[PDB]
Amino acid sequence: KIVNIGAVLSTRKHEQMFREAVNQANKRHGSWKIQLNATSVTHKPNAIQMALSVCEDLISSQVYAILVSHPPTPNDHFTPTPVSYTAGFYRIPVLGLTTRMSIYSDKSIHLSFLRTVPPYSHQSSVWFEMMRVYNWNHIILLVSDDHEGRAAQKRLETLLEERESKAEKVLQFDPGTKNVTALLMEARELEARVIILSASEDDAATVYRAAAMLNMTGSGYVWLVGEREISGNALRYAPDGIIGLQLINGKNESAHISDAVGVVAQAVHELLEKENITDPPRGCVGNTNIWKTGPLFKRVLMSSKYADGVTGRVEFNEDGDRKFANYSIMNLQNRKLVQVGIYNGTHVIPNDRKIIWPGGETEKPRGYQMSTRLKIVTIHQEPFVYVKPTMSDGTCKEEFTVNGDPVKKVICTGPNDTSPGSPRHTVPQCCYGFCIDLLIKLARTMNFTYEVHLVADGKFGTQERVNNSNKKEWNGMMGELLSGQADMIVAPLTINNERAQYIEFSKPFKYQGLTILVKKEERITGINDPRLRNPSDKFIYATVKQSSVDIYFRRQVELSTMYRHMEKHNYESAAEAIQAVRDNKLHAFIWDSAVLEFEASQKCDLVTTGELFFRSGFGIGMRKDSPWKQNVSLSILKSHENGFMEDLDKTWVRYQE
Amino acid sequence: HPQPCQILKRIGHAVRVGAVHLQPWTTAETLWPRDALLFAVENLNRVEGLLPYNLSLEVVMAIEASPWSSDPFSFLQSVCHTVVVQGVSALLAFPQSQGEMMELDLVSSVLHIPVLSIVRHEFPRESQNPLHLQLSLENSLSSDADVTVSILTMNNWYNFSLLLCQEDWNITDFLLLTENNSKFHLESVINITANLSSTKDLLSFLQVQMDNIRNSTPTMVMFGCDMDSIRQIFEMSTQFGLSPPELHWVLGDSQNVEELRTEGLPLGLIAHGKTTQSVFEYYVQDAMELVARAVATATMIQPELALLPSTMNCMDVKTTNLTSGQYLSRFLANTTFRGLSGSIKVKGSTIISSENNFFIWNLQHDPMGKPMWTRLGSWQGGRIVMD
Amino acid sequence: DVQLQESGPGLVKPSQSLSLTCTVTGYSITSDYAWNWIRQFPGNKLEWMGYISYSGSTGYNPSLKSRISITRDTSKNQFFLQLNSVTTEDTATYYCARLYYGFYGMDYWGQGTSVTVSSAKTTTKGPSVFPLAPSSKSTSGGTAALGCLVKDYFPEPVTVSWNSGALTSGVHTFPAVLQSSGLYSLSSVVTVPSSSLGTQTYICNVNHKPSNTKVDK
C-alpha cells in the first residue's frame, strides 16, 4: 500500500499536469491508500547524467514504477535506451510514453521493458484486424529499414502464421534506395498491391514520387501508413487520399499524460489487491540489487484487465504493447482528419467515413490483379507446336497451309538450345501450329494477354531429390511454374496423383495414349512381352530423361527392373531419340500415340505398333491458386464441344501422305 | 599526404583505449581482465608493425572510485568522467552479465564509439547496430558444420546420421546451414536417453538402430552428443566389431584436442580436434590485433580518420558528414585476417565468431601399430588441400 | 493545448546573434509541424522558407542553409536561433508559431513579435513620466482626443497592455515603419471608451518583452 509512482518529467508544465493527474486520480482507484510520489526531476541534455539523476531521485523515495511523461527523449537518437537500461536491472516496467519506435517493443535482449506506447506492431495488428473483410493477405513489404523494417517483417510473419495464410513478397530493404522504380515495377507485376512503408518519411516521399511518376497512386494500390511516416516532408507529392493512421495517445501531452497516470494507478492498485507484493531491496548505485521476484512481478502486472469507459477491453499484446490502443484511422482526403474507423479491441468499425483513395473508388478497391499475364511456355512438340526458325530479324512470313490460307503465328522468343547450349540466349522463332490457333481462340473468347516463350531447357523434370537445398519437387518447366516464371503450361502433361499434389490441371484437349514406335525379333507386341520387359545391356531402346515415359516407368510397380535399365540411353530431348531410331541406331521408341502416328505417316521407315495403352486425356497444367483455373477449362470445353478443334487437329496433326 | 598535426594535441598522438569493466569475472568463470590486458599489451609491444603511423594503444585503466559485478552506473559515469579528460579514441568492454552488456548499446548510441562485446554465453541480437559489435568467442557449431559439408562434398556422401542426443546446444545454426545445402539426407536419428532406464532395452534399441543404418546411411556424425554418448559408442563398437566400412563413425563437433577421445578409436574414422583453446588471454590478444588492423586500415584510408576522436565528452556524438565510427566499423568487416586463436572473420559486425583452424586427422590403419593422427588433408578456412 | 505565443526577444543589437525563443508548449514538438517564421515586410515579397524537424533542420533558404544553427532545446519544448548578419528586408515581423506543414493559411488573430535593427542603448532611454491629463473639452462625437502619452521605451512590437486589464473594445495591432532613432512613441487608443466626460482615467501600461515593466506612467 506504499507503491509510489516514479515519474520522469522534463518541463514544469509536465510537472503541473502530473500533479493534477495525481490529484484527480482519486476517483479512478476509488481513493485508495496508495501514496503517489511527486518526484519532479529537471531535464538534462546528457543522456547518462539525466538517467543518473533520475535514478538518484527515485532511490531517494524508493518508487516502484517508471512514468516517462515527455515525448522528447534525452537520448540523441530519440530512443528509450537510458530509461530501459536503468530499469531493467531493477526489474521495473517503464510505463511511460517515449517514442513510436517498434524495434524496442520486442522483448528480446531486455526483460523489463513494458512500454505502453503503441508501436508499428500495433499498427500492423490493427491493419490485420481491419483487412479481415477486404481479403488482402498478400502484402508487398517495401519497408527500407534495418530495425523498424525487421520488426515490421517479423510482425507480418506472425500475423500470416496466426491467419493460416501466406504473403506475396515479404522482404526487407536497406535505407537509402535509389532504384525505387524497379521496386514499383516488381510490385505492379505481382497480383498484390498492398504497398506498406514504415521506415521513415524520406523513403515515403521517395516512393510517393515514384508512384506519381508512373501514375500508379491510388489506382488499386493500398497505401496504409501512419502519422510518423507522413510527418515532416512526406505529403508534398502525395495526392489527397492517402490513408494516414494518426497516432492516438502517442504524442499528446495534455490528456495522454493523465490517461497514462490513471492506467498506471489502476495497474498498481490491481497489483496490490493481488499477491506477490514483496518490497524489493534498496536499489542504490554500486550494489547488486537484482529483484528475485522480477518475472513474478511482471507476470502479476501483465494481467491488468480493467473496465474503462473509453476503451472496452484492455490487454497487452505479445510484445507488451499498449492495452488495445484506440487507433483512429484518418484519411488525407482534401487534407483533413476525418475518422474512418476505431480500434475498439476486436474489430475496427467505421463510424461515418469509409476508405478513400486518390486514384481509386470510395468503395472496396481491387487489390488483387487479373490473370491477363499467362506466360505460355512451349516445348519440343513439332507435331503440335511447329517451332520454325525465324526467316528474318523478327519477320515471320505466314506460310500457306493445305487449304491455301495464311495461318497467323506468334513469335516465340526463347533459347532454342538446352541449358548447357544456350543458357539465356533467347532467340526468336516463328512458332506455329495448333497451339497458336488454340491460344488465339482463347484470347478471342477471354480478355487475357498470352505470352509465348520457349523454355530454356528441353526436359520436363522429375520429382526426385534435387541438388537445390533438398527440394523434392520438379526440376524444369514445372519447377519454373512453381517459382513464378511460367503461368500456364500449354503442354499436355500426363495427369497423375504425383503432379496433382503440387499444381492442378485443366480440361484435357488432346485425348491420346501411349504406344511404342517400331521399324516394321522385329515385332515388339507391346511391353508385356518378356523380350522387352526384362532387356539386356544391348537391348535398350530409346528413352528420354525427365519425360512422361520416365514418370510412367517410375510410377510402375512391376517394371522396376526396366526402370534402372533405361538410365543408359537417357537423352535430353525426343528429337535425338527420333533421329536415332530413324537412322537404325536403336531398337524402338516409346512416346505419345499422336506423335508416333505423325512420325509414321511422315517417315515411311518408322512403323509404330497398333497396341495402344494408357488411354488418358492429358490436361493442361495450371497453377495452384490461379483465379481463372476454371475459366480456361470451360473455354477449352466449349471449344471442343463444337466442330473447330477437331477440324484443326484433322487439318494440322493428321498429315497423311 | 595531409599531415594530421592539428588533432593530436589533446590525445597525445596515441589511441586512448578505455579499460572498462575491470571487475574480476565471478558470474557464470574465474578469468582475470588485468592479466589478459597486460599479456595483450606485451604481445603488441613484442611484435613490431602492428601499430603503424607511430601510434600506440594507450590502455587507460578506467576503474570506479561482488556489489560491483553488474552495476552500470559505477562502470559508466566515473568511467566516462575519467576517459573524456583527453579524448575518447577506442574502448574495449568486458560484459559480465546483461546489466554490463545492455549499457554498451547506449554508449555506442550516445558517443558513436565502436565497442567490443566479449560475452560468455549467447546473447540475443535485438540491437542490430554496427557500432555495438558482438564478439562471442566460444565453441560454436558453424565451423564444424562447414567442415562436415566440405567433407561430404569432397567424398560424395549425401546421407548422414544425425546423432541428436540432447537439444540444449547451438543446433539452430546447424539446421540453418542444412536448409541451404542439398547434401543432407536424414532417415533416422540416433538417441541415447529416449526414456530407457535399464540397459537391456538401450542395447536392443542401439542394435536395431545400427542394423537399420548399416544400409540406410553408413555415416554417423557427432552433432550435439555429449562425451558420455561418444564413450558408450566407442565401447560398443569394439564389442560389436563396427568397422568404418560397415559403420563409419564421424566426430563432427571438435571442441578441443585435450578433450578429444584417444582410446578405442577404430582404424579409419574421422575424428577432428580444435587446435585452439578457450583461453581468455588469446581472445583479448585477437581482439587487440583486430583493433590494430582496423586502425591501420582507417589510417590507410584517411590519415585524419583514426587519429580524430569520435567524442570528447560524456554526451558528445559524432553526427557530421565525415564521421569516424561508421568507417571504423565498416573497414574491419572487409579486411578479415587470421588471428592467433582462430581466424577473425567479421560476420556483419553483429554475429562475429572466430572460425578456428582445423586439421583433417583421419586415423587410418597404422602399419607400425601406433595410433597417430594422420594429416590426410587441411583446412585453411573453407579450402582443403589434399595430398 | 493550443499556445502560439511568440515570446522571442524583439530588440537586440545590430548584427548580433538573435536567440529567437519560440515557447510553443503545445501538443508535441517531435517533428509534427514546420515552426518557421514568415518574412512579411512592407515593400517586397517573401520566399518559400524551410522547416525544422527532430534532427534540427536549420536550413530555411539556400543562402543561410548552413550559416545559422537552430539549437534543439527539448528541456522547455522550444528552440533557439542564431541569425547572424541579417539584412533589412530579412529582419521583419516574425511569426515563429505552430505553422502547420502545408502553408494553408490562418484561423486566428494577428500576433507575433517583430525584431528591429535598432541598438539597445538607443531604444532604452527612460520611461517618459507624463501625468495623464483628462481633456474633457473636445466633445465632438464618439471618438475624441484622449489617451496616454508614454514614450521613450522599447519598440512598438511588444506586449501592449492596459491598466490591469482595462476595456479592449476595438484593439488591433498593425506593423508600421519603425524609427531608427529609437524614440518609439507607441500609444494605443480605444474607440468607444476614454471619450466620455467626468474623471474617468484611461492611463495605459504597455508591457515589454525583455523588461516586463508595467509601472511606468
Three-state helix/strand/coil letters over A424-435: CCEEEEEEEEHH
| CA nearest neighbour of B190 among B198, B182, B181, B202 | B202
Q: Which residue type occupies A223? A: W
Partner-chain contact B106 A468, CB within 8 Å: no
Q: Is B378 left (phi over 0), alpha (psi -120 to 50) or beta?
A: beta
Q: How far is CA B165 from CA A130, A524, B177, in A?
A: 46, 57, 19
Q: Are A112 and A91 in contact (CB under 8 A)?
A: yes
Interface check for C1 against chain A (CB to CB < 8 A): the answer is: yes
Contact assessment for residue A434 and residue A490, using Cβ atoms and an 8 Å cutoff: no
Q: What is the DSSP string of A15-40?
A: HHHHHHHHHHTTTTTTS-S-------
- Strand-pair partners of A618: A510
CB contact under 8 A, B314 and A89: no
Q: Cα-atom radius of gyration of chain A, to the nearest Å?
A: 35
C-alpha span between A476 and A457 (Å, rounded) = 7
The runs of H, that is alpha helices, within B279-382 are 280-301, 303-306, 325-331
Closest CA to A52 of B75, C77, B83: B75
* Chain A 279-298, residues with CB within 8 Å of chain B CB atoms: 285-288, 290
The nearest alpha carbon in chain A to C1 belongs to: A254
DSSP-derived letter for residue A125 is H
B190 grid coordinates: 540416433
The span from the CA of A436 to the CA of A442, in Å, is 10
What is the bridge-based pairing of β-strands A620-622 and A613-618? unpaired
Whether the CB-CB separation of A98 and A66 falls below 8 Å is answered with no
CA distances from C34 to A11, A125, C29 (A): 22, 31, 10
Q: Are A288 and B106 an interchain contact pair (Cβ–Cβ within 8 Å)?
A: no
Chains that touch B (3 or more CB pairs under 8 A): A
For residue C34, the chain A residues in CB contact (below 8 A) are none
CA distance B318 to A76: 11
Handedness of CA B151, B152, B153, B157 (dihedral sign): positive
Q: Is there a contact between B379 and B360 (Cβ–Cβ < 8 Å)? A: yes
- Cell numbers at residue C44, please? 517586397
Strand ranges (DSSP E) for A284-425?
328-331, 338-343, 348-349, 375-378, 385-389, 410-415
Q: Is A623 annotated as a binding residue?
A: no
Q: What is the dihedral of CA A225, A229, A233, A237, to 10 degrees?
A: -20
Mutant choice from B73, B76, B152, B311 vs A, greatest count of A C-beta within 10 A: B73
The answer to whether residue A79 neighbours chain B at the CB level (below 8 Å) is yes
Do the beta carbons of residue A247 and residue C31 sit within 8 Å?
no
Whether the Cβ atoms of residue C6 and residue C115 lie closer than 8 Å to each other: no
Give the number of other Cβ atoms within 10 Å of residue A328's Cβ. Answer: 18
CA distance B44 to B38: 10
Joined together, the cell numbers standing for residue A203 give: 523513403
Residue B76 with chain A: CB contacts under 8 Å: 48
At B193, phi and psi to the nearest 5? -125, 45
Nearest-CA distance B129 → chain A (Å): 9
Which chain A residue's Cα is nearest to B109? A77
Are A502 and A480 a contacting pair, CB within 8 Å?
no
DSSP-derived secondary structure letter, A342: E
> Does the annotation list A60 as a binding residue?
no
The SS3 call for residue B163 is strand
Half-sphere exposure of A592 (CA within 13 A, CB side): 22
Query: How many of the other CB atoms lie within 10 Å of CB of A30?
Result: 7
Identify the CA nearest to A183 among candidates A202, A166, A167, A196.
Answer: A196
Q: In this structure, which amino acid lies at residue A118? A: P
Q: What angle do CA A539, A543, A549 make, to 5 degrees?
A: 120
Residues in A touching C75 (Cβ below 8 Å): 10-11, 42-45
Residue located via cell numbers 500576433: C111
- Given an 8 Å threshold on Cβ–Cβ distance, is A109 in contact with B319? no
Q: How far is CA B158 from the centre of its chain?
A: 28
Q: Are C32 and A235 in contact (CB under 8 A)?
A: no
Q: SS3 for B104?
A: helix
Core vs surface per residue A371-384: b (16+ CB within 10 A) or e: beebbbbbbbbbbb
Q: Burial, A212: exposed, middle or buried (Cβ in 10 Å; 0-12, 13-18, 19+)?
A: middle
Q: Are B266 and B243 in contact (CB under 8 A)?
A: yes
Concatenated DSSP letters of A55-106: HHHHHTTT-S-EEEB-SS-SSTTS--HHHHHHHTTTT--B-SB----STTTS
Rounded Cα distance, A373 and A376, in Å: 9
Contact call for residues A540 and A563 (beta carbons, < 8 A):
no
Given CB atoms, is B316 within the 8 Å cutoff of chain A? no
Beta pairing, strands A510-517 & A589-592: antiparallel
Q: Which residue is closest to A98 within chain C, CA to CA?
A: C30
* CA neighbor of A532 nearest in space, from A602, A609, A456: A609
* Residue A548 annotated as lining a ligand binding site: yes
Q: Would the CB atoms of A288 and B66 count as touching at under 8 Å?
A: yes
Question: How near does any CA of chain A get to the CA of B64, in Å?
Answer: 9
CB A286 to CB B106 under 8 A? Answer: no
Q: What subunits touch chain C, counting only 3 or more CB pairs under 8 A?
A: A
**CA gap A509, A490 in Å, rounded:** 10
Q: Do B72 and A86 touch (CB under 8 A)?
A: yes
Phi, then psi, of A431 in degrees rounded to 5:
-75, 130
Q: Tell me whether residue A494 is annotated as binding.
A: yes
As a dihedral over the C-alpha atoms of residue A49, residue A55, residue A58, residue A63, rounded to 10 degrees, the angle is: 150
For residue B111, what is the nearest residue in chain A, using CA coordinates? Answer: A76
A592 is in an annotated binding site: yes
Q: How many CA atoms lie within 13 A of A131 on its CB side?
A: 21
DSSP one-letter code for B160: -
CA distances from B324 to A46, A163, B86, B320 (A): 21, 46, 17, 9
Residue C187's φ and ψ, nearest 5 degrees, are: -155, 110
Are B73 and A285 within 8 A, CB to CB?
yes
In sign, the C-alpha dihedral spanning B252, B253, B256, B259 is: negative
Cβ neighbours for A197, distance < 8 A, ≥ 6 positions apart:
A142, A143, A203, A204, A207, A225, A229
Asked whether A369 and A350 are in contact (CB, 8 A), the reply is no
Q: How far apart are CA B122 and CA A624, in angstroms?
A: 42
- What is the signed CA dihedral for A132, A138, A144, A149, rounded to 10 degrees? 50
Q: Resolution of the deposited coordinates, in angstroms? A: 7.7
Per CB distance under 8 Å, which residues of A are interface residues toward C? 10-11, 13, 42-45, 71-72, 74, 78, 99, 231-233, 235, 251-254, 335
**CA pair distance A556, A548, nearest whole angstrom:** 12
Residues 6+ apart with CB under 8 A from B9: none
Q: Does C103 touch chain A (CB under 8 A)?
A: no
Do C214 and C205 contact (CB within 8 A), yes or no? Answer: yes
Question: What is the full DSSP assignment across C95-111?
Answer: --S---TT-----S---
- Comparing CB atoms, the residue among B69, B77, B184 nearest residue A52 is B77
**Where does B240-367 show beta strands of DSSP type E?**
248-251, 269-271, 362-363
Q: Does A468 touch chain B (CB under 8 A)?
A: yes
Angle between helices A434-445 and A629-641 (to 10 degrees): 110
| Helix, strand, or coil (residue B122) | coil
Say which residues have a Cβ less than 8 Å from residue C143's Cβ, sequence separation at least 6.
C191, C192, C195
CA nearest B284: which of B22, B24, B40?
A: B40
CA atoms of A206 and A214, how far apart (whole Å): 13
Q: Method of determination? A: cryo-EM
CB contact under 8 A, A89 and B126: no
A91: left (phi over 0), alpha (psi -120 to 50) or beta: left
C71 touches chain A (CB under 8 A): no
